[PDB]
Every structure is written in structure tokens, then in C-alpha cells.
Amino acid sequence: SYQDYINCSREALLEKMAELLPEKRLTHCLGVERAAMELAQRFGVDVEKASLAGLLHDYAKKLSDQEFLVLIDRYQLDPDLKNWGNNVWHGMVGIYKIQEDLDLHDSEILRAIEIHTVGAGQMTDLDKVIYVADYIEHNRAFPGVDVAREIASLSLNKAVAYETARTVEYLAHQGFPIYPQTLETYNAFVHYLKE
Amino acid sequence: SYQDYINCSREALLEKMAELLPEKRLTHCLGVERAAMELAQRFGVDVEKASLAGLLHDYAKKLSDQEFLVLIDRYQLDPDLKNWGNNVWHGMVGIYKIQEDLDLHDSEILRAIEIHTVGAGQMTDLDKVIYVADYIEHNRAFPGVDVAREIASLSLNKAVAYETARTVEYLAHQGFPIYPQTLETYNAFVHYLKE
Ligand SMILES: Nc1nc2c(ncn2[C@@H]2O[C@H](COP(=O)(O)OP(=O)(O)O)[C@@H](O)[C@H]2O)c(=O)[nH]1
Ligand SMILES: Nc1nc2c(ncn2[C@@H]2O[C@H](COP(=O)(O)OP(=O)(O)O)[C@@H](O)[C@H]2O)c(=O)[nH]1
Ligand SMILES: [Fe+3]
Ligand SMILES: [Fe+3]
Ligand SMILES: [Fe+3]
Ligand SMILES: [Fe+3]
Ligand SMILES: [Mg+2]
Ligand SMILES: [Mg+2]
Ligand SMILES: [Mg+2]
Ligand SMILES: [Mg+2]
């Protein structure tokens, strides 16, 4: 059960999240919970750790900038983090709010949430499952989500590769700054697109 | 005259380059020489340093992988350079071959050639002129070269921004590794696209 990792039941958690997140965002988290379970079954990852990390991954999506800045100071995180914003913060810094609220201390689950947006050069299979689940969950409708879904049915690594390449491409298309850890993921995984 | 910086005349240099480079590549270098002069006039850069750096920028385009690897060892350059290829090497490492052949020691000209492909987070106006001249020279015909030309008529910084964003975008589109210094340039300049 989820209470093996956090300080409340799944139902209690959903009630809490429903007050923290807009409906669309909670529906997304439920989609990621389901997609993570499916991916974990396929690729040999603990389904429960995957489901819980999937449900929790966007728990901190709505924290204020000021809240994130307070957390960076309090936990003495990389000071360069203050040069970024919610996109980087909600996973990389938001894990500390999840930990405070829910008594989440499992290192694997925390790491998977931490890097769910940007990835890393080295990712555990759990990390990859969350990173991909987030992108392919049933409620997502962006062009090429179908390609991502097909790839994810066959290869976890290639699915990470596809997502990271499409993300870097779109960030540059839009003219948005690219977090250096995002590039680390990109350069580590892009070769799988030849797979 | 060019002999103020190198060990031969412009005519002698062209004769040498014609044996080192395919016709198309030498024509490109001549295009960059001209474009660099125009940009330097517009943006307050020494026209002669610009023209010479423009002509020379792709001098090392055709060196073998083995030649580049020898230069990396000989000059004890960043050992990470061995993980890359001609795209990174021809400017970043090729400057040493230019220096050996032509007795080029001018630090400003060398730096502008060095970073002409990838840029840097901090670029001199000469660096920017070469970086942009390369992209917009008259022989270039790629989609959106017209946009780059228009921007370059107005703002050197915005032209760097446009080129770097389009390059990162295309590298991710194609699935090619992105050199970390390229990202440094991208993150430093992308804000100018709001200009
Ligand atoms: N500026 C910036 N945004 C990024 C980067 N990587 C991902 N993002 C964006 O962060 C946003 C949230 O991403 P993610 O956490 O994966 O999905 P979500 O929380 O379900 O929307 C998206 O718009 C991504 O494109 C980056 O390196 N830089
Ligand atoms: N793999 C890779 N290629 C790059 C990077 N930056 C630029 N290039 C490519 O290097 C090639 C040569 O670039 P450049 O020196 O600017 O132009 P050229 O020498 O006149 O063709 C082009 O195909 C660029 O897209 C990078 O970060 N990684
Ligand atoms: Fe997220
Ligand atoms: Fe999400
Ligand atoms: Fe070049
Ligand atoms: Fe060139
Ligand atoms: Mg994040
Ligand atoms: Mg993250
Ligand atoms: Mg180069
Ligand atoms: Mg270069």
C-alpha cells in the first residue's frame, strides 16, 4: 500500500491533492499513475513505486515562486536554481515539499520525481518510467504523442530519447532557456534514436 | 593588408586554400569574407580583422580526424574534445593548424575562428560578426536564411540569437549531440529574440 511510503492512504492523498491542484492537473497525475504502472509492468520496475511516483510527480506544480525560493535556501540547494522557474523547480525543488507534507523518504521515489521534467545523464529504470509516463499518459494530446506511445510499447530507452529530443527541439523552437541537466539527458540518450 | 597578420598576401593565401578546400568550400569562405566586411562596417568592428577571420574561418574544414586528434594531444587541449568530430574540431582545434601554416598569432582573429561554429556565452563583436557572417553569406540557401539576413541588418545580438536557436532546434530535430558550449551560447543569447 501507499502507506508503506507515505503518511496517509491513497484515498487520503487524493483528497489532499484535490485541494492543492486544479482538476486538470489532478486528472493528469491520475493518468501518470496508470501509465507508470503499465510501463513498470513492461520494463521490470516495481509497479507500486512507479504508481506512487507517478501520482505524486506534479504534487508541487502550483507552489509559488516565493515558496520554491524559500525551499532552495532552507535545504541549501544549488544556488543556480534561483535563475530558473516553475518548470525546473516543481520536480527538482518540489520533492522537499512532498517530503515535508507526506513523510516521503524513499530515495528511489524521490529521485524519480526530482528529475521527472529534465531527466539526467544517468537514470534508473524507475526514473525513466516516470519521465516517459508523464509524456504519454492517456489525457495528453500534443502532436506526435502517438509516436511516443508506440516507441514506449517497445523500448524504454528509445522513449526517453524521443521525449528529450522533442523537448529540446521545442524549447529552441519557442526560444526558451534550456536547463543544463536537460542537455545532459539529451546527449546521453539521443543515440537510441538510431535503435 | 593581410600580411600584417599572416605570413603571405591575400592572393598567396587564396592559392593555398584552393589546394586545401573543394571549390564550393572556398567560394563559401569568400562569401564569409564579404559578409564579415559588411557586418563589421555596420556594427563597429575592424573591417580587416573581420574580412581575414571570415576568409580563414573554414580553413581547417577538410583536416582528417587523425590530424585533429594529433593536434588535441600536441596542444594539450581539453581531452573531452576527442568525444566529438569535425563540426566541433574545425574551428575549436583547427585554429592551431591555421596558426602553424600561416603564422597567425592575433588573439582576436584566432578566437573568432575558434568559436565560429559553437559560439560562446561571452562573444566579442568580432566573434559575433564571424558567427553571423558564416550563416548569412550570399551563397547560403537554407530555409529561413532570409529571416537571418533581415535580423542581421538590424541587430548583431539578435542575429546570433536567431542562428543559435535555429541550430539547437535543428540538431535536436535531426537527433545529433549538442556540444555544451553551443548551449552556453544559446542560453546567453536567446533572450534577444524578444528584442
Ligand atoms: N525552460 C525550460 N523548460 C523546460 C525544460 N525541460 C522541460 N521544460 C518544460 O517544463 C514544462 C513542464 O514539464 P513536465 O514537468 O515534463 O510536464 P508537466 O509538469 O506535466 O507539464 C514543459 O512545458 C516542458 O517543456 C528546460 O530545460 N527549460
Ligand atoms: N553535432 C553538433 N553539430 C553542430 C553543433 N553546432 C553546430 N553544429 C554543426 O556543425 C556544422 C558546421 O557548422 P559551421 O562551422 O557553423 O558551418 P560550416 O563549416 O560553414 O558548414 C553544421 O552542420 C552545424 O549544424 C553542435 O553543438 N553539435
Ligand atoms: Fe511536471
Ligand atoms: Fe506531469
Ligand atoms: Fe565552419
Ligand atoms: Fe563556414
Ligand atoms: Mg521539475
Ligand atoms: Mg525535474
Ligand atoms: Mg568548429
Ligand atoms: Mg567553433
UniProtKB/TrEMBL annotation, chains A, B:
- Binding of Mg(2+) 3 occurs at 117
| Residues that, per the record, bind AMP | 179, 182
CDD domains from the UniProt entry? HDc
Any one Pfam family here would be: HD
Matching Gene3D superfamilies: Hypothetical protein af1432
Residues that coordinate or bind Mg(2+) 1: 114
What molecular function terms (GO) are annotated for this protein?
Answer: bis(5'-nucleosyl)-tetraphosphatase (symmetrical) activity; metal ion binding; nucleotide binding
EC identifiers of the protein: 3.6.1.41
UniProt-annotated binding residues for Fe(3+) 1: 28, 57-58, 134
- Reaction(s) the record says it catalyses: P(1),P(4)-bis(5'-adenosyl) tetraphosphate + H2O = 2 ADP + 2 H(+)
| Residues reported in the UniProt entry to bind UMP | 87, 179, 182
Binding annotation for Fe(3+) 2: 58, 90, 116
Task: Indicate the segments forming the HD domain, all copies.
Answer: 25-139
Binding-site residues, dTMP? 87, 179, 182
Q: Which residues bind Mg(2+) 2?
A: 116, 134, 163
InterPro entries (UniProt xref): Diverse_Catalytic_Enzymes, HD/PDEase_dom, HD_domain, HDIG_dom, YqeK
- Which keywords has UniProt assigned to this entry? Hydrolase, Iron, Metal-binding, Nucleotide-binding
Query: Residues that bind GDP, according to the entry?
Result: 25, 61, 87, 140, 177, 179, 182
Listed binding positions for UDP are: 25, 61, 179, 182
Q: Which residues bind ADP?
A: 25, 61, 140, 179, 182
Classification via NCBIfam families: bis(5'-nucleosyl)-tetraphosphatase (symmetrical) YqeK, HDIG
Name the record gives this protein: bis(5'-nucleosyl)-tetraphosphatase (symmetrical)
